[PDB]
Write a protein that binds this DNA or RNA. Structure first.
Ligand code: K
Ligand code: K
Ligand code: K
Ligand code: K
Ligand code: K
Ligand code: K
Ligand code: K
Ligand code: K
Ligand code: K
Ligand code: K
Ligand code: K
Ligand code: K
Ligand code: K
Ligand code: K
Ligand code: K
Ligand code: K
Ligand code: K
Ligand code: K
Ligand code: K
Ligand code: MG
Ligand code: MG
Ligand code: MG
Ligand code: MG
Ligand code: MG
Ligand code: MG
Ligand code: MG
Ligand code: MG
Ligand code: MG
Ligand code: MG
Ligand code: MG
Ligand code: MG
Ligand code: MG
Lengths: 97, 199, 55, 203
RNA sequence: AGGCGAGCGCCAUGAUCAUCACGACACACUUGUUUAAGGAC
RNA sequence: GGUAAUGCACAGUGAAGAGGUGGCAGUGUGCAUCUAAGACUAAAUACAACAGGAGACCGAUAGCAAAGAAGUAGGUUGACCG
RNA sequence: ACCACACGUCCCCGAAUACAGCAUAGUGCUGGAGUACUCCUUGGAAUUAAGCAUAUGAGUAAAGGAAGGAAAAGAAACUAACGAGGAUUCCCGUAGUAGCGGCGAGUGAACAGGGAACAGUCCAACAGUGUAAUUCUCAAAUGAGAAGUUGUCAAAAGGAAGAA
C-alpha cells in the first residue's frame, strides 16, 4: 500500500514562487453611476405606492416596544435564514427612524 | 338575437353555458357580473386616483391649445426630405410611455396628460408619484381615445410637451394653475383615502 | 425458442417435455424447446462474447 | 426606463395594490373555460424577458391546473404486492404543476410551437399560467431574425420531451458534484454508462 | 396612575393588540324559488 | 454512493440587490472560486427495416418458423396459433 | 420481339373529412402510419437472502406521450487547495476504491494523469424624437389602406475544391 507515509507537517510544505499582484477595478465610470442611481430611485417609488406587508407591520410594532429578541425569533421563522433576518431588521429599523 | 336585461345577466351562472353557440352570452354574463363586484369593494389610495378626471369643458380648453403642435404625417415627411433644412427647431407634442418616462427622468418634460381607462393598469400606475417627485404638473383624462383625437392618430396612454411658444404663454400658465388645483396640489391628502363603495 | 409451448404434466401417459399449443395441423402436441427435440434450441448457444484473439 | 418600475411593483406581492389586483383577476380566470386565449400579456415586463413581441404570429393563451398531490390509480387501495409499496396518498408528482399546463395547451393549439410560460395567480383550488405560442407557417415569422429558429423540424413538440422552461426542471441537469446522476445527458444515459461490460480485442 | 396584611402577594379600574357569541347588510360560494332564493354559514 | 439531506415534487411561509459554493449539524470572522431563476450550437458517440462486401459458421430432423404459390396449407366465437 | 431508365394514367374501403380544433392582411396548419437507436412520464412480480417482513432483482419489464438521421447534452451561481487548472460528448484509468447496507445478502460514484474531436454566441435589463426611420396590400410612377407608440426596426454577394 503506497498511501499514508508522510506526516501532516511535511505535506504542508510549498515551492517558493514569485507572485503577481491583482489588478484592482475600483474606478466606476460616469454612466455606471447614473445607472445605479436610477435603479435605487425606482425602489423608492414602489415602497411609496404600495406600502409595507403584514409581517413587516408586525415586526416594526415589536421594535417600538423594544422586544428585540422576540422580533429576532419571529423574523428567523418567516425568512428561514438568520442572515436575511439580521439584514431585514436593520432595513426596517432605518425606515422607522 | 334578443338583448337580455341587466337582471337576467346577473342571474345566470357562467359555468353552465357550455356549447359553442353560447360563447358570446358567456362573455356578456362575465362582463356584467365583474362590474357589480368592483363597485362593491374598496379601492386602495393609489388606484383610487384614476377615478378623478377633467371635465369635457376643460378637455376642450386643453385640446384647443395643444392641437396646434400636431405631429407630421408620412405624406408631409416625404416632402420635407426632398427639400432642404430651413428655419427654427419645431415644437411637437410627444407620445408613448417609453419616451415620456425618459423625458420626466431627464427633467425635460413641462406638462403631461395621462389616460384612465387602461388595462392592465400597472402600465400607468406610477406616473403621478414620479411627476410629484420631479415637480412636473399633470392632469388625468377619461379615455385613451380622448388623447388620440388631439394628435389625429391611434389611441395612446400618455402625451407630453417640453416647450412653449411665446404666442401661447399666457393661456398656458392659466391652464397649469387650473390643473394644479385638481391634481398636484392635492396629492399628499389623496394618498391616504380609500375609495368608498359606490352609491 | 419462438413457439408457444407448455408441459401437459403427469397423468396423461406421456413424458413431461414442453409441447406446442396449436390446432388444425400435425404440429399440435409435438415437443418444443429442449435440446433433445426436433426444431428446439441447441445446448449452450454459440455467442459473440468468446475471446477470438490471443496475446 | 419604464420596465424597471413595473419590475419593482410586480415583486411586491403583499402590497395593497397587488392584493387588490390578484383577488379580482383570480375571480375572472375561474369563470372562463379551462384553456382560453388572452387579449395580451397580464405582465408586460415578465413577458418581454421571456421573448414576447407584439408582432403577427405570436399569441398568449391562459390555462388552469388543480392543486395538491396526485393519488395512485388503484381500486379500493389494493396493490397486489409487498407492503412497502401499498401507499396510495401523499404521493407527489415528478414534474411541476406548470408542466401540465404547457402539455395541455400544446394539444389544443396543434399548429403552433410552445416557447415559454409564467405564473399569474393562485387560489384555494386552482393555479393559473400564461403560455407564449408562435406560428411557424406565417410569412412574418419565417423572415424574422430572432425567432426564425423555431421553424427547424427538431423544434416540433418541445414540451413533450422536457425542453421548455417549465418542463426542464424535473430532469436534474446541472454542473458539478451535486449532479453526478446526469453525467452523459440524462439519468438513463448515466445508467447505461455504468451498467455495461467492455470486452476488448486483446485482453 | 389606586386600596389591604405583620417592597412582597392579594384585593380595585384605567389606558394598549389579538379574540368567542349575537345582530344587519350583500360581493365570494350554493340551488331549474333563476328578471328568484339563501349567504360568509 | 451522498452518509445530522444527493436530486425532484406538493402545501404553508417567503428575500436581498447583491448573492451562491468549498462531500461532517450549529454560530461568528477573514480567505479562495463562481454568477441561478431566459435561449442557440458543429465535430468526435448509438442502432431496425433496405442495399453492398467478407467469413477456421450451418449444410435439408441442421441453418431463420419458412432453400418451391411461407406467416402459406390449415385452425380459435375471439384475442391469437401454425 | 424483348430489356433498362424516367414520365403519363392510377377502381372501392381505410386518418376518411361536405369533419374537428386552431393561426394570419391573406395563403393555411395539425390528425393516421413507424418507433431498433434517443428524450419525457408511469411503474410490477417471479427471483436472491438457503425461512421472511426493510433490502435485492430495478427505476428493469409492461402501459402511455414525442422527434430525427442520429437524438440528448453543452460554453461554469465548475473543480481544487497544486508552483493549480479551465464548454459538452466519447475512449483508457482512478475502482469493485471512498462509502451505502436486518453493517446481512449485496450494492457503489467523482477530481487527477494519458488520448479522439475541437467553436463559440444570442435575447431582456438598454434604439435616431429637428418627427416610426419598421413590416404588409392594392394602385401608380407617385397615391390610398392594414399592423404597430401596452414599442416596430441593430446589413453583403461571392467559390473552387472535396466526395460518391
Ligand atoms: K418463450
Ligand atoms: K420590495
Ligand atoms: K394582431
Ligand atoms: K413517479
Ligand atoms: K458496474
Ligand atoms: K339578506
Ligand atoms: K342576490
Ligand atoms: K328578497
Ligand atoms: K446558458
Ligand atoms: K420447420
Ligand atoms: K390461412
Ligand atoms: K403521431
Ligand atoms: K427466498
Ligand atoms: K431455496
Ligand atoms: K424485469
Ligand atoms: K440538438
Ligand atoms: K439544447
Ligand atoms: K468538466
Ligand atoms: K485531456
Ligand atoms: Mg496521514
Ligand atoms: Mg502549498
Ligand atoms: Mg433449429
Ligand atoms: Mg427549483
Ligand atoms: Mg452533505
Ligand atoms: Mg448432405
Ligand atoms: Mg427447416
Ligand atoms: Mg370451430
Ligand atoms: Mg417462499
Ligand atoms: Mg428497492
Ligand atoms: Mg440500484
Ligand atoms: Mg417497454
Ligand atoms: Mg438588447
Amino acid at each position: 500500500m503506497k498511501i499514508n507515509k508522510l506526516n501532516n507537517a511535511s505535506k504542508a510544505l510549498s515551492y517558493p514562487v514569485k507572485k503577481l499582484a491583482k489588478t484592482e477595478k475600483a474606478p466606476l465610470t460616469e454612466k455606471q453611476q447614473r445607472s445605479k442611481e436610477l435603479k435605487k430611485f425606482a425602489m423608492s417609488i414602489a415602497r411609496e405606492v404600495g406600502g409595507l406587508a403584514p409581517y413587516e407591520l408586525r415586526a416594526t410594532e415589536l421594535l417600538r416596544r423594544d422586544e428585540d429578541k422576540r422580533c429576532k425569533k419571529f423574523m428567523k421563522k418567516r425568512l428561514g435564514s438568520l442572515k436575511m433576518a439580521k439584514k431585514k431588521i436593520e432595513l426596517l429599523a432605518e425606515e422607522m427612524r | 338575437d334578443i338583448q337580455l336585461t341587466k337582471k337576467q345577466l346577473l342571474s345566470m351562472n357562467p359555468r353552465k353555458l357550455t356549447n359553442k353557440a353560447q360563447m358570446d352570452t358567456r362573455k356578456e354574463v362575465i362582463a356584467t357580473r365583474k362590474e357589480a363586484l368592483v363597485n362593491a369593494i374598496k379601492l386602495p389610495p393609489a388606484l383610487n386616483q384614476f377615478t378623478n378626471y377633467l371635465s369635457e369643458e376643460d378637455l376642450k380648453e386643453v385640446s384647443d391649445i395643444l392641437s396646434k403642435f400636431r405631429p407630421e404625417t408620412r405624406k408631409e415627411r416625404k416632402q420635407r426630405l426632398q427639400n432642404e433644412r430651413k428655419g427654427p427647431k419645431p415644437i411637437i407634442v410627444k407620445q408613448g410611455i417609453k419616451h415620456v418616462t425618459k423625458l420626466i427622468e431627464e427633467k425635460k418634460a413641462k406638462f403631461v396628460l395621462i389616460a384612465c381607462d387602461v388595462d392592465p393598469i400597472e402600465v400607468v400606475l406610477y406616473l403621478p408619484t414620479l411627476c410629484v417627485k420631479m415637480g412636473i404638473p399633470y392632469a388625468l383624462v377619461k379615455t385613451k381615445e380622448d388623447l388620440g383625437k388631439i394628435i389625429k392618430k391611434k389611441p395612446t396612454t400618455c402625451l407630453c410637451l417640453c416647450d412653449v411658444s411665446s404666442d401661447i404663454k399666457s393661456k398656458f400658465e392659466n391652464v397649469i394653475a387650473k390643473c394644479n388645483g385638481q391634481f398636484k396640489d392635492n396629492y399628499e391628502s389623496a394618498m391616504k383615502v380609500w375609495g368608498s363603495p359606490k352609491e | 425458442m419462438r413457439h408457444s409451448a407448455k408441459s401437459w404434466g403427469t397423468g396423461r401417459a406421456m413424458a413431461r417435455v414442453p409441447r406446442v399449443r396449436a390446432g388444425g395441423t400435425r404440429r399440435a402436441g409435438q415437443g418444443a424447446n429442449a435440446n433433445f427435440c426436433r426444431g428446439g434450441r441447441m445446448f449452450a448457444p454459440t455467442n459473440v462474447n468468446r475471446r477470438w484473439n490471443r496475446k | 426606463g419604464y420596465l424597471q418600475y413595473l419590475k419593482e411593483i410586480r415583486r411586491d406581492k403583499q402590497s395593497s395594490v397587488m392584493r387588490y389586483l390578484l383577488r379580482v383577476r383570480c375571480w375572472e380566470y375561474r369563470q372562463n373555460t379551462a384553456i382560453h386565449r388572452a387579449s395580451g400579456p397580464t405582465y408586460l415586463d415578465k413577458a418581454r424577458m421571456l421573448g414576447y413581441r407584439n408582432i403577427p404570429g405570436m399569441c398568449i393563451f391562459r390555462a388552469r391546473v388543480r392543486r395538491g398531490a396526485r393519488p395512485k390509480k388503484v381500486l379500493k387501495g389494493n396493490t397486489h404486492g409487498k407492503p412497502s409499496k401499498s401507499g396510495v396518498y401523499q404521493r407527489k408528482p415528478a414534474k411541476r404543476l406548470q408542466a401540465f399546463a404547457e402539455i395541455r395547451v400544446g394539444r389544443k393549439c396543434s399548429n403552433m410551437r410552445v416557447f415559454n410560460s409564467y405564473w399569474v395567480g393562485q387560489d384555494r383550488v386552482y393555479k393559473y399560467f400564461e403560455v407564449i405560442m408562435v406560428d411557424p407557417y406565417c410569412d412574418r415569422i419565417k423572415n424574422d431574425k430572432k425567432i426564425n429558429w423555431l421553424c427547424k423540424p427538431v423544434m416540433k413538440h418541445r414540451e413533450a420531451r422536457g425542453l421548455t422552461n417549465g418542463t426542464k426542471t424535473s430532469r436534474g441537469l446541472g454542473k458539478g458534484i451535486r449532479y453526478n446522476q446526469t453525467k452523459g445527458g440524462s439519468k438513463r444515459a448515466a445508467w447505461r454508462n455504468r451498467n455495461t461490460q467492455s470486452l476488448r480485442r486483446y485482453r
